[PDB]
From a paper:
The crystal structures of EndoMA1 were determined at resolutions of 1.60 and 1.80 Å for the apo and ligand complex forms, respectively. We focused on the complex structure because the apo and complex structures are nearly identical (Cα root mean square deviation (RMSD) < 0.27 Å for all chain pairs). The experimental SAXS profile (black open circle) and theoretical SAXS profile calculated from the dimeric crystal structure (red line) were in good agreement. The C-terminal putative CBM domain in EndoMA1 is conserved only in its closest homologs.
In this study, we identified four enzymes (two GH183 endo-d-arabinanases, GH172 exo-α-d-arabinofuranosidase, and GH116 exo-β-d-arabinofuranosidase) from Microbacterium arabinogalactanolyticum. These enzymes completely degraded the complex d-arabinan core structure of lipoarabinomannan and arabinogalactan in a concerted manner.
Residue numbers in the entry:
A (entry chain A), B (entry chain D): 2 to 480
């Protein structure tokens, strides 16, 4: 939909230009999902789906026959400061230098093309990784699974065994093929959808110590929680996709993220069986074309909700953030309009929620040309101060946080990124020189006694034919 | 010298192809030194000298006017597992996205061109960073300092203040311009050289709690430790460079590393005043041309000695290892001859410590063409198995570790790296596909009942015109 996107892009976690350099460290050049859990020993384990190496070019999933295709990979993090990104400090490798596949797959189309992780947790000293055996893919959003299964690790993710616990899908419509786990007290709640993205969500529950025991599961039936999987009724209507559920102590509610039709949405509840509050837009397909996934980071605190989001054309995973209040409502949205430049193919005049820029400028539009999506802004010349800017309404005497992604031609010598009055008077800014990789800059400032500021990035072009590219600019209120 | 190098290359820590991605994370594209100390809170702080960003090309230090020249930068590590590299998890930045200069300099040639860190230590809640103010550079190994100073931080390296504590260089020949600190019980020993690389080492000591109080220093005079700095006498003869001193519990000895003339060497002592055992070669200038630095990692144990080495042409820092026994003697040297390919401009026949390769092979030779140095091997073809190898003598029944750096054409689909019998039958190998970045591969294997093996790397070339490059190959006994 054309709905505004409240969420802010924090970091590209995988693939080309990722700070993590997963491409160079582990041959993780393109991948998806980024499913996260706390391992119980002060780390976050992150699992990924179909993953390609060095020869991948994009756009989209899939690579040449030498693309080192793995069905899944697994990395760790110790990073407790997500505002500045999420560093990966370990991966499961084999050989050393190459992140390996942890759950094997036959890679025979129409039998088992792949194995895709769906949700993870730890209990005591064991790690558990739900996954689906994919028989074949169909059109976007449509695919057939053989079963949901569970792998486990007793060494912190270093080695993995596939358990004998399965939800078979003989008729295709089994309602727990793609799971999402959340612990509350002694119970693990187990959300489930069918294979693909067109059906509803159901819910089951299991004592935390009995996750692998099918006989200990009980299924919400409308009235109570009973023994038979066939008694499960939906708790959230179609369409639902891959899901993530988190119990948020700030708001004292469960939070659920999924792609529902076109957009990633969030719903909230105080009971896992519902009622579930209506969808709130997290990210729209207009701003983030061909987005999917949406998994909560286990260390979310204080209503500052970080999550991973996937996108088809760059086929890589992004760390995102949004803010909730104590009722689970999204507040303090990105105040920049058309933050990822995807909504227009031209600049405007900088007013009424448009971008403007000095000659020569434009919106580059090509598969995966953006930091995210297919659009980015640029400016380029060989004389003088050359900038891109937007007028944003703000609250008098409030404090704001500006982030955005940029890179320059190698010969760039002096640019700036920041906020200024509508008359050009700087409020707060940083200074960059030459920027190779897509790089995030970050400026915090007081609005002062004004109700509008101009957010901007630019380069001096006195020294030569110099350019700057810009994407995914966010202005959010602080607190 | 032409002496063999026992030391093994572990990882490129900074710059192009570095796993750490310092270039993309922090605009650290080219740098030197990598001076390390324990911060007393579970981390390793690492400081660097003159640092350049995105527009740096090399070879050598120095960059175009837009090179984002900083006199020094600082990064952190929490990595306890040095065999597979040293991950940096934090940097002092300003603006965010750019590692900043922590000790300011005037950048006025012949007044103060730069400020260069020398040695570091923590006592209680405070970090200290010794530095030299450089008035002007001379020919290689020759420069003039104004003084040696000490900066400090009370917040784990986040913010720095330059202290009033100084060793002025009035007569040009002050013996403590370029320091190395080592702590033993309650005492810091402060080794010192004159400016540049052609004089001797002296030694002082101070109570660890009184590092900033000049009055508290005592200076080894040949009989005891006295109050006057002009009473200090040499404990190690010229020529001495930058130095690193560690107390090694394993061997119960002080270990000292320095460039001494052409080669980096190590000396050992049970007392800081000496006597110092004779120099042992660490790395030779023939294998590692224009090498410098050599700083011990503070978490070394068990006789596994990790250190940082600098090299002019690539102008970046590498992690290195050697092994010592309990007398501080270097053992289990790299058995591969001409590990870095620097000793010849052509291939040999694979015997008597030479390399061999299939058609079409060569030694590529240009400034900074190597992973390290100017030389790397290549093999390239469009049919069949295409490999580079060397016959290496081994001990029957012993276990070996093979590491080496390689990368391929994008179109590579199936290569191997390992050890095999002289008749070509693999003993232990790994399988790579397409390798973008210079990437280290690692194989451990048992020699069996054999007196020699062939270490190799190669690619299958049936799928197209495909090439592999190779450098810095090491075979070391395990344990
Ligand atoms: Ca975009
Ligand atoms: Ca070399
Ligand atoms: Na995928
Ligand atoms: Na972080
Ligand atoms: Na330097
Ligand atoms: Na490591």
């Amino acid at each position: 939909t054309t709905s505004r996107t409240p969420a802010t892009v924090v970091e590209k976690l995988t693939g080309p230009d990722a700070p993590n350099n997963t491409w160079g460290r582990w041959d993780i050049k393109a991948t998806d999902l980024g499913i996260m859990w706390d391992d119980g020993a002060g780390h976050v384990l992150t699992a990924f789906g179909d993953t390609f190496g060095n020869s991948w070019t994009g756009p989209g999933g899939g690579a040449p026959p030498n693309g080192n295709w793995r069905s899944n990979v697994l990395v760790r993090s110790s990073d407790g400061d997500l505002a500045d990104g999420m560093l990966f400090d370990w991966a499961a490798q084999g050989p050393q230098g190459v992140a390996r596949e942890i759950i094997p797959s036959k890679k025979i189309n129409g039998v088992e093309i792949t194995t895709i992780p769906t949700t993870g947790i730890s209990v005591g000293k064991r790690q558990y990784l739900g996954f689906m055996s994919v028989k074949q893919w169909g059109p976007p959003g449509v695919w057939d699974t053989n079963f949901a299964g569970i792998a486990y690790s007793d060494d912190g993710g270093g080695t993995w065994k596939v358990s004998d616990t399965r939800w078979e899908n003989a008729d295709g419509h089994d309602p727990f093929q793609m799971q999402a786990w959340v612990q509350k007290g002694g119970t693990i709640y187990v959300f489930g959808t069918q294979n693909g993205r067109n059906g509803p969500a159901s819910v089951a529950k299991v004592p935390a110590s009995k996750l692998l025991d099918k006989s200990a599961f009980r299924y919400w039936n409308g009235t109570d929680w009973s023994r038979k999987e066939s008694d499960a009724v939906p708790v959230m209507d179609a369409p639902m996709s891959e899901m993530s559920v988190q119990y948020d102590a700030y708001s004292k509610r469960f939070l659920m993220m999924t792609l529902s039709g076109e957009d990633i949405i969030m719903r909230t509840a105080t009971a896992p069986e519902g009622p579930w509050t209506p969808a709130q837009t997290v990210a729209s397909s207009t701003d983030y074309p061909a987005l999917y996934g949406g998994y909560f980071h286990p260390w979310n605190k204080d209503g500052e909700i970080y999550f991973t989001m996937s996108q088809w054309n760059p086929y890589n995973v992004y760390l995102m953030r949004l803010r909730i209040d104590r009722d689970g409502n999204i507040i303090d949205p990105n105040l920049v309009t058309d933050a990822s430049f995807e909504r227009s193919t031209t600049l405007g005049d900088g007013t009424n929620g448009t971008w403007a820029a000095k000659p020569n400028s434009g919106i580059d539009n090509a598969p995966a040309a953006g930091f995210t999506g297919d659009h980015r802004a640029f400016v380029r010349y060989n004389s003088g101060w050359r900038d891109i800017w937007q007028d944003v309404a703000v609250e008098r005497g409030a404090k704001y946080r500006l982030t955005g992604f940029l890179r320059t031609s190698v010969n760039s010598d002096n640019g700036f990124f920041g906020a200024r009055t509508l008359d050009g008077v700087p409020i707060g800014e940083i200074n960059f020189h030459s920027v190779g990789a897509w790089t995030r800059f970050t400026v915090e400032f007081d609005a002062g006694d004004r109700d509008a500021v101009q957010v901007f990035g630019g380069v001096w072009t006195n020294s030569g034919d110099i350019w700057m590219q810009l994407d995914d600019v966010s202005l959010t209120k602080v607190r």
